[PDB]
Design a protein around this motif. Structure first.
Motif, PDB file in Angstrom:
ATOM      1  N   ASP A  62     -49.164 -99.264 129.930  1.00 24.87           N
ATOM      2  CA  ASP A  62     -50.563 -99.660 129.870  1.00 24.87           C
ATOM      3  C   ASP A  62     -51.348 -99.004 130.999  1.00 24.87           C
ATOM      4  O   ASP A  62     -50.908 -98.977 132.153  1.00 24.87           O
ATOM      5  N   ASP A  64     -54.906 -99.525 132.138  1.00 22.47           N
ATOM      6  CA  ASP A  64     -55.595-100.562 132.904  1.00 22.47           C
ATOM      7  C   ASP A  64     -56.317-100.023 134.133  1.00 22.47           C
ATOM      8  O   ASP A  64     -56.777-100.810 134.969  1.00 22.47           O
ATOM      9  N   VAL A  65     -56.430 -98.705 134.273  1.00 22.87           N
ATOM     10  CA  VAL A  65     -57.163 -98.083 135.370  1.00 22.87           C
ATOM     11  C   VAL A  65     -58.047 -97.017 134.736  1.00 22.87           C
ATOM     12  O   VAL A  65     -57.593 -95.897 134.476  1.00 22.87           O
ATOM     13  N   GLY A  67     -58.820 -96.347 131.950  1.00 23.77           N
ATOM     14  CA  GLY A  67     -58.358 -95.820 130.680  1.00 23.77           C
ATOM     15  C   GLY A  67     -57.837 -94.397 130.721  1.00 23.77           C
ATOM     16  O   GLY A  67     -58.184 -93.582 129.860  1.00 23.77           O
ATOM     17  N   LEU A  68     -57.006 -94.081 131.712  1.00 22.73           N
ATOM     18  CA  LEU A  68     -56.381 -92.771 131.816  1.00 22.73           C
ATOM     19  C   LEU A  68     -54.870 -92.911 131.693  1.00 22.73           C
ATOM     20  O   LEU A  68     -54.287 -93.916 132.109  1.00 22.73           O
ATOM     21  N   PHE A  70     -51.084 -92.103 132.484  1.00 22.28           N
ATOM     22  CA  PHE A  70     -50.196 -91.646 133.553  1.00 22.28           C
ATOM     23  C   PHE A  70     -48.984 -90.942 132.941  1.00 22.28           C
ATOM     24  O   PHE A  70     -47.856 -91.438 132.950  1.00 22.28           O
TER      25      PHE A  70
END
Lengths: 353, 292, 4, 196, 178
Positions: A62, A64-65, A67-68, A70
């Motif tokens: 997810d 949650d930052v 929308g980028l 990782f």
């Protein structure tokens, strides 16, 4: 002889792989050979491509930052199987020729030459239940039917299999690990002298590790305890590469050493996964899917290669720590520490043929 | 009249918008996504703090229109403490979210272990406790005076007024305006330079626009009120209609940030958007023979 | 912030 | 390189027993320990398994809840606690070793210890002649040694395996064809010498 | 659960002959099939693993192969030390299930049993008749009642004449016998 097969959700195109474990020799990586079976009736004017990608995951699934995602792609290779591209003149592996003979004339080969000095398949243990997707480096072979590469591909028209890029222990043993550290506190007398060593450099998974500790305490400070631990170092290389540390095994004895005396003992440690299920971010060996894995094998690297190799580089060391009692005219519970590090190699023996 | 009801309407609409948005985000967070991530806890805490801070708008508004405080001493202390405590709580929650995102982007390896939801709960509890160091003393000095013609709710100082009131003013200026904006701008600048240090270009531009609009809305909402408070403290100002619409407008914008925070941090999150939309095929790997 |  | 089993004997239905499998030359973490039993006149049946590397532990569907397997890594030994021993548990229990990583069959197996859960007790063999051999009945427990003329005509005699009778006690027969037959029961220290 | 069907349950071969042992799996195991050899009174010994790989120390005359879910163990030249019971295991899924077991015996000419009848001794009835088949071949044989439930016992193959032996005992009453 058996080969692995997978078909698309629509069942039209299927890809054949001889094996899903590819040995990473330091000088070169084993080629990824395979054959994809297609049908001209389905593909009116499209061309099927096979892509081998190396995916490195920074954090949890997810975002949650902002929308980028990782998820880095360290290496991506592409090839056009059908129609047969006149650009590449690669030869045919015996397994590929056998697959073409077994399959019909609608079978076309693909081959990937993975460049050397790339990270291996490593997955980080999530510890407690927090995420549903793993985090680490992995390789995957994807074949899809599309008009051109710069085009969104439907998940129903694409196959994808995870493959493992593995390394085995070197055929010859190396120099015996050995470390020395001398320390004097206030220039009282001859300094404390700690010496530690291992019986061999290369250990296999599940084998015990014998630590030969020899201490000659020549100062006036009594040694309270001696702590031996095996620590796993994970070089998670990225922009501003960092260092992950995790004690995999430990043994804290209560063997005191008197001033002006000596103490030689051998401590036997064994790193295993039974007592390390609660350690988040522990480097595992990265199997195909959720299955029986073990501690990640030590990454072998070329001594004359580039240092900034992204991914995870796993290494192991043995730390022998002596906690010496501290206190003079004033008696406190504080203490000092004298520690050494013994790097060793943890791999799998090469399979015998 | 014409010049005395616009302020009331502005305060009322700002308050109702803030409470509506805050209640919506609280309900969605607590019922649907169920607070299973650190970020969800952060936005839930921001929503609670902003709702509590904005809930005092009716009290101040009716104190303004009546020219007196008809509630009482207990409600006077409660409203003062709530306002101060929750303003600090909101700003500090913004700071903690900024540093959390900075740690997540600039240090993903450290974020893998520093973003445990337990750690997020600890951080939010620590923030609420740290913000209490002004919430209790203001409650310990919030008795009311029978002013001639008014029962106005103000802050009491038994020590030199011109010293301690200015001390509290400057402490709020330094610990709630300049250090928070410094933290936010440093964290977001480090994030954007880390992103630019590398379809991806469009996403990077979107992220830059998002962080820029967050910083811009914060530094546009919170600076006018602090600047005008400093100006008022320095030099006395004549009272006119323009004076009495600006003084209040600054406060209205300061609560506009409190409203916009939910409008930005929540209603643009991908998981939150999916939950809001809710509110409103792979084969297996087998094997085959190979004749020799 | 300020109480008016 | 060696596996030694111990702790088997006569048990009563419902009793308890504990088998020990000491592993010499193997590491308990680089190898998994398995228990395979072989009923008299039957095939091999897997019973339990333990993996010290993962801490995993598996049992057969017919032994779950009753049998418990553990391992003491200090002594490189594996234990199998067996509670509520039903009569169907009469077998020879083998402790086997397999590679923990990349299992490649049971490489090493132990000699195995017979576990008898018969409810009977030690009895004496009743000798009856056959006018030429002798038959022993109610000779529990196994084994029973028989010889003709105290070992003279040992070459020309055929002895049948002991079969468990309905009463629980075993019985055996022997025959010789062209005297005196001597039988010795080790579990009861009873020697009988009869002449047909 | 997977049940492995090992056939035949028993066969008789000679030295130098070629022997094939078949093993069929209910479900589909990829290659996790191992072959073991157990002699009477001895622990089993692993012969092949992965259904094709020969274990270290096993004579090269043993060979394994797979065809779908049908596994086969082949002995090219049967030796006198290669006559024992062979099992077939499947370690693909837990629990690990073995086969029924194929017993290999030496093949010889057909032999006729010398049937004897022994009435019960008076020292016992103060009560079990027995029919004794000695030195017969092959293993299969029947018995005929002649004066409750009868119990039959069979010995291992004789080392001298490569024959068997059988004795069936039954307890009678005092009505027909007296």
């Amino acid at each position: 002889t058996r080969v692995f097969k997978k078909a698309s959700p629509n069942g039209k195109l299927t890809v054949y792989l001889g094996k899903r474990d590819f040995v990473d020799h330091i000088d070169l990586v084993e080629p990824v050979d395979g054959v994809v079976l297609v049908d001209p009736e389905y593909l009116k004017e499209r061309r099927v491509y096979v892509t081998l990608t190396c995916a490195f995951r920074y954090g949890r699934e997810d975002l949650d930052v902002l929308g980028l995602t990782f998820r880095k792609d360290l290496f991506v290779a592409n090839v056009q199987s059908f129609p047969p591209a006149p650009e590449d003149k690669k030869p045919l592996t015996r397994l590929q020729e056998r697959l073409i003979k077994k399959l019909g004339e609608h079978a076309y080969p693909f081959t990937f030459e993975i460049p050397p000095n790339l990270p291996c398949s490593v997955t980080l243990q999530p510890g407690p239940e927090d995420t549903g997707k793993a985090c680490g480096v992995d390789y995957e072979v994807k074949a899809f039917c599309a008009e051109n590469l710069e085009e969104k591909i439907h998940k129903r028209n694409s196959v994808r299999l995870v493959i493992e890029k593995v390394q085995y222990a070197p055929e010859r043993p190396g120099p015996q690990p050995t470390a020395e550290t001398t320390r004097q506190f206030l220039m009282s007398d001859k300094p404390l002298h700690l010496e530690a060593s291992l019986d061999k450099e290369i250990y296999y998974h599940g084998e015990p590790i014998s630590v030969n500790v020899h201490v000659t305490n020549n100062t006036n400070k009594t040694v309270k305890k001696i702590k031996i631990s095996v620590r796993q170092y994970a070089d998670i290389c990225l922009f501003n590469t960092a260092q992950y540390k995790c004690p995999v095994a430990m043994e804290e004895a209560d063997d005191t050493v008197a001033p002006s005396s000596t103490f030689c003992k051998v401590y036997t440690l064994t790193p295993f996964l039974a007592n390390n299920r609660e350690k988040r971010g522990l480097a595992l060996d990265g199997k195909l899917k959720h299955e029986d894995t073990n501690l990640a094998s030590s990454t072998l690297l070329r001594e004359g290669a580039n240092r900034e190799i992204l991914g995870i580089i796993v290494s192991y060391k043995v730390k022998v720590k002596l906690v010496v009692s501290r206190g003079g005219l004033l008696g406190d519970l504080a203490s000092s520490d004298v520690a050494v590090e013994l790097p060793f190699t943890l791999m799998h023996p090469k399979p015998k043929e | 009249m014409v010049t005395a009801i616009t302020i009331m309407a502005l305060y009322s609409i700002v308050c109702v918008v803030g409470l509506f948005g805050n209640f919506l985000v609280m309900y969605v967070i607590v019922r649907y996504t169920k607070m299973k991530t650190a970020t969800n806890i952060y936005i839930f805490n921001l929503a609670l703090a902003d709702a509590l801070a904005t809930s005092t708008l009716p009290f101040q508004s009716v104190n303004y229109l009546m020219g007196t405080w008809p509630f009482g001493n207990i409600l006077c202390k409660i409203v003062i403490s709530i306002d101060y405590y929750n303003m600090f709580t909101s700003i500090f929650t913004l700071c903690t979210m900024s540093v959390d995102r900075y740690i997540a982007v600039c240090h993903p390896v450290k974020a893998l272990d520093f973003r445990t939801p337990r750690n997020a709960k600890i951080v939010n509890v620590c923030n609420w406790i740290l913000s209490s160091a002004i919430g209790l003393p203001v409650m310990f000095m919030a008795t009311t005076k029978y002013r001639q013609g008014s029962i106005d709710c103000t802050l009491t100082f038994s020590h030199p007024t011109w010293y301690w009131e200015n001390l509290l003013k400057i402490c709020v200026f330094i610990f709630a305006f300049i250090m928070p904006v410094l933290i936010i701008t440093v964290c977001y600048g480090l994030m954007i330079l880390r992103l630019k240090s590398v379809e991806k270009d469009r996403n990077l531009r979107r992220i830059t626009r998002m962080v820029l609009v967050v910083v811009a809305v914060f530094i546009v909402c919170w600076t006018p009120i602090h600047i005008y408070v400093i100006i008022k403290a320095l030099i006395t100002i004549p009272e006119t209609t323009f004076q009495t619409v600006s003084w209040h407008f600054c406060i209205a914008l300061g609560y506009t940030n409190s409203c916009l925070n939910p409008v930005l941090y929540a209603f643009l999150d991908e998981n939150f958007k999916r939950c809001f939309r809710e509110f409103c095929e792979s084969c297996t790997t087998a094997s085959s023979s190979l004749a020799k | 912030y300020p109480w008016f | 390189v060696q596996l030694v089993e111990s702790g088997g004997g006569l048990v009563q239905p419902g009793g308890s027993l504990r088998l020990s499998c000491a592993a010499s030359g193997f590491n308990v973490y680089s190898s998994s320990i398995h228990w395979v039993r072989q009923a008299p006149g039957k095939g091999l049946e897997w019973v339990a398994s333990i993996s010290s590397y993962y801490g995993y532990t598996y049992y057969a569907d017919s032994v779950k809840g009753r049998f418990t397997i553990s391992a003491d890594t200090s002594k490189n030994t594996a234990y199998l606690q067996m509670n509520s021993l039903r009569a169907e548990d009469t077998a020879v229990y083998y402790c086997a070793r397999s590679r923990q990583f990349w299992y490649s069959g049971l490489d090493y197996w132990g000699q195995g210890t017979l576990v008898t859960v018969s409810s009977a007790s030690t009895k004496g063999p009743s000798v009856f002649p056959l006018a030429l051999g002798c038959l022993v009945k109610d000779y529990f427990p196994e084994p029973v040694t028989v010889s003709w003329n105290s070992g003279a005509l040992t070459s020309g005699v055929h002895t049948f395996p002991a079969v468990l009778q309905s009463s629980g006690l075993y019985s055996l027969s022997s025959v010789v064809t062209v005297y005196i037959c001597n039988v010795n029961h080790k579990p009861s220290n009873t020697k009988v010498d009869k002449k047909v | 659960d997977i049940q492995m069907t090992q056939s035949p349950s028993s066969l008789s071969a000679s030295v130098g002959d070629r022997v094939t042992i078949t093993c069929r799996a209910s479900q589909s195991v990829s290659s996790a099939v191992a072959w073991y050899q157990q002699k009477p009174g001895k622990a089993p010994k692993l012969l092949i693993y992965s259904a094709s790989s020969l274990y270290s120390g096993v004579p090269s005359r043993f060979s394994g192969s797979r065809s779908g879910t049908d596994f086969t163990l082949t002995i090219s030249s049967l030796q006198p030390e290669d006559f024992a019971t062979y099992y077939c295991q499947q370690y693909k899924y837990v629990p690990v299930t073995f086969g029924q077991g194929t017993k290999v015996e030496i093949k010889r000419t057909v032999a006729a049993p010398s049937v004897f009848i022994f009435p019960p001794s008076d020292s016992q009835l103060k009560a079990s008749v027995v029919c004794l088949l000695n030195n017969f071949y092959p293993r299969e044989a029947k018995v005929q009642w002649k004066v409750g439930n009868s119990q039959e016992s069979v010995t291992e193959q004789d080392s001298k004449d490569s024959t068997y032996s059988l004795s069936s005992t039954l307890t009678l009453s005092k009505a027909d016998y007296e």
